[PDB]
Amino acid sequence: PGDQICIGYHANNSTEKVDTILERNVTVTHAKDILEKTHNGKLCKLNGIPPLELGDCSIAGWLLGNPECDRLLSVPEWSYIMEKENPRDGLCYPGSFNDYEELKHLLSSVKHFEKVKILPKDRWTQHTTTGGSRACAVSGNPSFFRNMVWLTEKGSNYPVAKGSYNNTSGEQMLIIWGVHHPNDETEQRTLYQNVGTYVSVGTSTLNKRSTPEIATRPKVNGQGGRMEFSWTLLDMWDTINFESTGNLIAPEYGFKISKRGSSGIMKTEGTLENCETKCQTPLGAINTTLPFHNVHPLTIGECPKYVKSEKLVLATGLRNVPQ
Amino acid sequence: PGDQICIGYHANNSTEKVDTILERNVTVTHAKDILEKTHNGKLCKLNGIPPLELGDCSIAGWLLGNPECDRLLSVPEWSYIMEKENPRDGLCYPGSFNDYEELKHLLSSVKHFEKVKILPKDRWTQHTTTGGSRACAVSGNPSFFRNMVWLTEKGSNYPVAKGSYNNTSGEQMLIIWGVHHPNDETEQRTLYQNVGTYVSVGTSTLNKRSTPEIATRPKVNGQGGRMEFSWTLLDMWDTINFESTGNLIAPEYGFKISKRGSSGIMKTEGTLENCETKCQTPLGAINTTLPFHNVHPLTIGECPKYVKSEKLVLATGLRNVPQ
Amino acid sequence: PGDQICIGYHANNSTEKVDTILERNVTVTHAKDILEKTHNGKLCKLNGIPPLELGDCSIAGWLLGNPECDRLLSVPEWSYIMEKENPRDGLCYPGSFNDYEELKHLLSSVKHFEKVKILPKDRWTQHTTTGGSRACAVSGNPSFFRNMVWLTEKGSNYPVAKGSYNNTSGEQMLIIWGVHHPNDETEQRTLYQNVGTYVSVGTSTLNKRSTPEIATRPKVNGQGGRMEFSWTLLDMWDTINFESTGNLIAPEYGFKISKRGSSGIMKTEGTLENCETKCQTPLGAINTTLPFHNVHPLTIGECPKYVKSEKLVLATGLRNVPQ
Amino acid sequence: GLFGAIAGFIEGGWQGMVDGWYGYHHSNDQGSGYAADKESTQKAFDGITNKVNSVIEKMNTQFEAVGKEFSNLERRLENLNKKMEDGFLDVWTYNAELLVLMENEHTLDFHDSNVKNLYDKVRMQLRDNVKELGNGCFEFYHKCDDECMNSVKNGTYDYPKYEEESKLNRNE
Amino acid sequence: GLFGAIAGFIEGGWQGMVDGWYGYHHSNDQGSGYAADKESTQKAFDGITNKVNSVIEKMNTQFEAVGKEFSNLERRLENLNKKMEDGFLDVWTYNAELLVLMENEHTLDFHDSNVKNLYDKVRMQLRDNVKELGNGCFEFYHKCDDECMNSVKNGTYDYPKYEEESKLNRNE
Amino acid sequence: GLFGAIAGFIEGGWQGMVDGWYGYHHSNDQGSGYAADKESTQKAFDGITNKVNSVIEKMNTQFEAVGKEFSNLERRLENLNKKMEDGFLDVWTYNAELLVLMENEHTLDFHDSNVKNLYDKVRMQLRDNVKELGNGCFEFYHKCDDECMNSVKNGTYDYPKYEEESKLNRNE
Numbered sequence A, B, C: 001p002g003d004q005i006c007i008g009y010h011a012n013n014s015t016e017k018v019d020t021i022l023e024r025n026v027t028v029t030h031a032k033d034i035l036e037k038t039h040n041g042k043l044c045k046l047n048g049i050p051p052l053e054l055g056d057c058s059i060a061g062w063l064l065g066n067p068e069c070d071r072l073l074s075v076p077e078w079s080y081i082m083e084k085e086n087p088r089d090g091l092c093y094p095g096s097f098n099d100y101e102e103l104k105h106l107l108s109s110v111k112h113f114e115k116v117k118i119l120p121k122d123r124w125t126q127h128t129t130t131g132g133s134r135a136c137a138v139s140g141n142p143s144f145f146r147n148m149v150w151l152t153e154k155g156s157n158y159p160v161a162k163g164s165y166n167n168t169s170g171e172q173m174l175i176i177w178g179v180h181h182p183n184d185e186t187e188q189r190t191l192y193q194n195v196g197t198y199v200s201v202g203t204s205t206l207n208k209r210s211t212p213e214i215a216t217r218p219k220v221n222g223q224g225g226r227m228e229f230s231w232t233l234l235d236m237w238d239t240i241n242f243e244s245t246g247n248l249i250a251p252e253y254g255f256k257i258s259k260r261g262s263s264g265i266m267k268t269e270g271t272l273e274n275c276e277t278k279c280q281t282p283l284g285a286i287n288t289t290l291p292f293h294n295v296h297p298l299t300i301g302e303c304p305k306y307v308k309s310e311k312l313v314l315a316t317g318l319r320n321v322p323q
Numbered sequence D, E, F: 001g002l003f004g005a006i007a008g009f010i011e012g013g014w015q016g017m018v019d020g021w022y023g024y025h026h027s028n029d030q031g032s033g034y035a036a037d038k039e040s041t042q043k044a045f046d047g048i049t050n051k052v053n054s055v056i057e058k059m060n061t062q063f064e065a066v067g068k069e070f071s072n073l074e075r076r077l078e079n080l081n082k083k084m085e086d087g088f089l090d091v092w093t094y095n096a097e098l099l100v101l102m103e104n105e106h107t108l109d110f111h112d113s114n115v116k117n118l119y120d121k122v123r124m125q126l127r128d129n130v131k132e133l134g135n136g137c138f139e140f141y142h143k144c145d146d147e148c149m150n151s152v153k154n155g156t157y158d159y160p161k162y163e164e165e166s167k168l169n170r171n172e
């Protein structure tokens, strides 16, 4: 028996498993898990910028100024918007919001508004502007959406109601208006005096008219009547014109888009915590260098890529073979 | 010459071909075809549950109760719906069906209805309810959609027509209504007496109004007039309210969704045969354990996955090499 | 030392690089670039058929007959349509075009029209048809869309306006009509005499009505009023019926689809050159046998397949190893 | 083939070997005959079985076409739907057809490797007690009876046992 | 394994070789010990590193779900959106899971190849100056001290230098 | 390389071999020179040609972008369309770029295999009539003239013909 040299390979105490094509459950000396599976369970600031927490409010409740949503009358720049699945505080006076989903979609590219008083209430000198509803009651008294004006009869008169705003703000401006559809003729006459009325909205590109609809409907929040809201994004230097012989719910404000960018609405029942993140999901925040994650498909920020997988492990070392 | 041992490999009489990257048309000892290419040419029950065979009827003809569709007045639970490309029996009185495709889409998750008499005809004591049309003639006489009520003048009067239904059925309920748009004023006066009428429908979420349209139109099935139908899915415990000074086509019934599940409408001119299957296509039924098929992309049931391929054969054995 | 035979492999002066999984920037003896990266920078005929060059006109300006678009009054068969991002000459009388994008989509399968005089102007014997606008001025005088007829009062009368056309042309026919929404009542009375008017359009399948809307709007091209245009594709042997007590903008023509096929609208500021191609992009024409290209995703004709890649090179030869 | 055994230095396959993919033909005084190698055939069988389950199981959540309808005013949406469903159909067709081409290439090379590995196993055990003829056969320098052949086949050939006898025969 | 070295003719791995993936165990008069092969370990390390960057970088423009909402009259559009986002999710899941299975297969075979290549390199250098035992070991026909072992390990073994001494020992 | 021949035991390529991918350099009394192996070069050529047609033909039904427009009230639909077309674009980019990386790896290894297979073919035919030098060369133990070289190159080397002459030269 003489001197020897032997060729061989590394083995260790590793129990790391990988799958291959020909064989599953293979032990290897070294392996790299490329799937992030954990999150912090918290809603966080995204790059130091807090989300807008709607609380019990809907997007509509916020923008109309539902009195239950007063904390949201002036809000700072946000990184994302948190909304509940079924917020309680939306249209307190019942009705509908035309193209509501399209409005929500617009919000995913908007990070801040400046609310601008475009049609001061005091300027409606020929109409009453104090009208509210027990549906929007505040401290046991009739009130109304903060951003809106309910024009009604004054001195048993409702003359043609005309208002105009030129968007000189420097940015596109979200404006909302509504039409009141009463329950009955007594409601029509006592509020507006006129019968067979209309609401007319016109810009350079929009031409929209409504005739109000008097009909018996099931009471929602105590009201058989309905308010149908619409919106537009008024271009810079374009003018919006309102015109009505009755039933107009006028905006007092416009929301100038003051900041643009990648954003979004996250559906969650949770609340903002004092934590910071670069990637947020509805289940919690992710902090990883890994390329993939399986936490939730709907994420905001600088995120890994989402896959359905339970496991993604790359072999780096060799087959780990018993001594 | 001494004793020998030789290493070798299997060969057989196999003519099985596979393709590879470097070479096409390779003979191998064993191979596994993974593509199902055959079907039985029949429309079948799916897991013992027969489809709903519309025959010459459309979905609209069925739900309105086109008198040519009377076999469908009460139908049992189905696994899928068979409809012809161009069914003859739809709107016998001509017109349109608002959001018709959306209605058809709803049906792909519905497997049974219970038809409920929500607004008994006998309760319209102030209006005539016997009105029909030669467009919907039965045995040479004017008739009408079975599920609908044509309200007309009584004693040269048409008072405000009001009907209301609270969905206490325990499930969401499909309800359909219509508005009659006459050809001329003589038609308007003789049917409804009133001029400048409206139809109003309201639930907690829907507020829909139509004013009828008198216009000369090309005759369809002998009629210049048109009936425009709409629908809603009334929520449990929600109320629907109808209101009209004329031109209303009222439902007598509602279709309570009594069974939900994965279903669909299959476009076919064929007829149901006494056969059973787990996977149905418009060309016929599939019975296979193979993972892929190339029969038709539109399938219903527990199906293989569809690909466009003419062939998918996996080599399992080795290259089959001549002796 | 005896005689020798050696086994070896090819090397050359190649500097061709490829990437692999284990190693990037590998020199190989031979390689096949499969990505086309170049174009001629020109807009060209596609198989000898020139595109339709709209110039400063929009699709709407063309089909309505905006007087600035007169070169387009009769056009030959095209291979694609070139339109500018923001064409100057569209609706010279301001307004809107219902389902405009759907109309543009229809055009991507249309390669030629025959313009047919379906409702000769001379036949409106009870109405004035000479009316135009300074918004569509020609040589300093009021004019109008060439394909349209502005019906106005005659002898201080506007009797019911009725026109009808049976599509006997042999193909589906595009027809456009409009409704005038005036700025004020003085405009309503002086043009149409009647107040509380309507426009009614009916085929076997379409039933469309508009009541005009008098409202103060910002001046566009000098006009507070608006014209709202709609369109339909009238089926062979179907009849279109128009009916109005005022405000109708009638078509004089219909556009019979005389040629069908794969086509499209290309957004470009450029102009057609005397060149021929089989594959056109907005940046220029491609002439290649290569399977992939990275020029532009939006191409027309027999094109390679588009990928985002900067490079796609297949090794064909072996690793090029220094002598 | 990548490993050079099948249709390679082992020129042809054996019709007479019926009970496995790879194996032996022996020839001695007692006679001759084919026998499958049980261990290598079973290991190849397990791998291939796993491959055919793995390819099948990866396309269990393939895209499925849902039948929707669209009105004559919804042509862009109809086209979008059509493009999407056709788009996924082409993706999965490509996926299925490529996976199969690639895995077929690998399967054929896997078998080639298994034959080569079996040849080398036998070779590295017999050493200079045999002549390597170059055709997949080894010629013994010592008499190798039936029980000797079975020690080769089941991997327990005793080289030191035959060293001296082989050495003498190879020299003279 | 495809190349027949790992769990192959080299039956087991070495727990005692701690500083690399592949290498040597020597045994002579001066003593014994393990040593990693530096060149082959580093080349394998560079390849594997490149592979793990390449797999990661190919899924940098994966499909991302955007949260949209739809009304009760937009069920076909909602379903289309759902089918599309789920469609891409399944495509990328399949892509990620298959790339990993395929690249894991190749990684294990790459290591197997590297061991085999290292064995053949040493073998083709020692020639008949050694006995090939069949277990990954070579037995010298001449005394090979520590400096001789290091010439084997760093690829500068001098065959002509030992030819005559080996030849004599192998014969007698 | 996976098979250890190219940039492996055969250290470098031959600039002087111009008419094929793999082949021979001979050296004898009559002289020297390079010659391509015709059979192995053509077989590699057929495979590679098939591969480049196969990769091309698998992406013939790739997704194609259709130009659609959307109004300012159709932003969700526009975004859906954009996501879908961009989604497929990224799928096909990934597909094209990965297929190429993977097939490039295989192509280079295929060539490596072909060289190794050619070396082994020649080796398994010459047997102990030659010395294996370890660099891809064989040194004859008998005089091998030009016609002898061509029998090696076209695979009809006559080992029994030279056995006795080689045996004597190798021994003395």
Ligand SMILES: *[C@@H]1O[C@H](CO)[C@@H](O[C@@H]2O[C@H](CO)[C@@H](O)[C@H](O)[C@H]2NC(C)=O)[C@H](O)[C@H]1NC(C)=O
Binding pocket: A166, A167, A168, A237, A238, A239, C218, C219
């Ligand atoms: C609304 O306000 C603007 C800004 O004062 C008016 O004046 C011009 O509008 C253009 C529109 O593109 C702006 O770019 C300029 O700032 C203004 N030009 C000048 C010379 O002052 C605009 O006319 C107003 N609209 C109406 C209907 O009065």
Ligand SMILES: *[C@@H]1O[C@H](CO)[C@@H](O[C@@H]2O[C@H](CO)[C@@H](O)[C@H](O)[C@H]2NC(C)=O)[C@H](O)[C@H]1NC(C)=O
Binding pocket: A218, A219, B166, B167, B168, B237, B238, B239
């Ligand atoms: C319609 O019918 C329901 C059931 O009788 C009415 O009564 C309540 O409605 C709620 C709605 O969520 C149901 O959950 C309950 O079953 C009912 N509660 C009680 C205490 O009886 C409902 O009010 C009716 N709607 C109208 C407008 O009368």
Ligand SMILES: *[C@@H]1O[C@H](CO)[C@@H](O[C@@H]2O[C@H](CO)[C@@H](O)[C@H](O)[C@H]2NC(C)=O)[C@H](O)[C@H]1NC(C)=O
Binding pocket: B218, B219, C166, C167, C168, C237, C238, C239
């Ligand atoms: C419109 O014109 C057509 C063609 O002249 C009219 O006549 C028939 O219409 C059918 C419709 O499918 C055509 O196929 C035939 O060419 C015509 N048949 C006969 C026997 O002449 C059609 O009736 C006209 N429409 C109206 C309302 O008058």
Ligand SMILES: *[C@@H]1O[C@H](CO)[C@@H](O)[C@H](O)[C@H]1NC(C)=O
Binding pocket: A025, A027
């Ligand atoms: C994998 O193999 C291990 C032993 O290596 C065994 O104990 C276990 O059952 C397997 N694990 C799983 C989860 O399949």
Ligand SMILES: *[C@@H]1O[C@H](CO)[C@@H](O)[C@H](O)[C@H]1NC(C)=O
Binding pocket: B025, B027
């Ligand atoms: C494949 O090869 C066979 C012989 O193996 C030949 O007869 C035939 O033409 C080929 N088949 C096809 C369909 O290409």
Ligand SMILES: *[C@@H]1O[C@H](CO)[C@@H](O)[C@H](O)[C@H]1NC(C)=O
Binding pocket: C025, C027
């Ligand atoms: C690739 O390698 C070459 C030498 O082969 C080197 O000069 C160059 O930097 C590399 N090229 C790129 C673009 O990475």
Ligand SMILES: *[C@@H]1O[C@H](CO)[C@@H](O)[C@H](O)[C@H]1NC(C)=O
Binding pocket: D147, D150, D151, D154, D156
């Ligand atoms: C191997 O084969 C021999 C010869 O037939 C037999 O006696 C023995 O039991 C076998 N040994 C093993 C380890 O399987």
Ligand SMILES: *[C@@H]1O[C@H](CO)[C@@H](O)[C@H](O)[C@H]1NC(C)=O
Binding pocket: E147, E150, E151, E154, E156
């Ligand atoms: C290789 O190893 C020897 C022995 O230790 C050493 O002396 C020499 O410098 C090394 N040579 C090279 C080329 O690395």
Ligand SMILES: *[C@@H]1O[C@H](CO)[C@@H](O)[C@H](O)[C@H]1NC(C)=O
Binding pocket: F147, F150, F151, F154, F156
């Ligand atoms: C091979 O080469 C020899 C030597 O030149 C030649 O004579 C013979 O014809 C060839 N034989 C075959 C089988 O190709």
